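Sequence of Recoverin (Bos taurus).
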Amino acid sequence: GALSKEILEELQLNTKFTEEELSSWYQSFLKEAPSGRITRQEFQTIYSKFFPEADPKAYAQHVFRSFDANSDGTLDFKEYVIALHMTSAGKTNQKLEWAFSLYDVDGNGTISKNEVLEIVTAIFKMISPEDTKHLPEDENTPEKRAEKIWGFFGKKDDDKLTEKEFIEGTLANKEILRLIQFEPQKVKEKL
Ligand SMILES: [Ca+2]
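Predicted 3D structure, token representation.
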């Protein structure tokens, strides 16, 4: 039950739970997943159930992959809790390192233009059509959003985006933060 300490020490301010509460959640988690592991498909099922207004399978896959760039295998309880926090709790500004891992689809250490499009598209599919019509014209399709992000970083099509640059830009340029925003409720709310 002391997988809770490293969850807390990894999330810190990000956390919505105490060690005791995490242990309670864990005990319940073990009743459904006694191995303490869940697969990509099982993780996707969680998002499919709780975002019925959206098409969350791609998003949930990228979130699952954020930790290791691997669609195979599993998350442990720690990674599952962190993932739910990342998509659903706290402030985007406390998640920037994790956001880099999300956007670096292949895990090679830099973000490419295509990776931005892939992730932006997956996030876009988390938005209901009823909300999409309220987006600014120049941010109302995945291609427009992804190209705006790339332009804000000053990039040519074949350039690579490093973690240093990503963190600087998402901190400093709040338009970049708005466009890379991956929490579905926050995209909805600033919209
Ligand atoms: Ca990459």
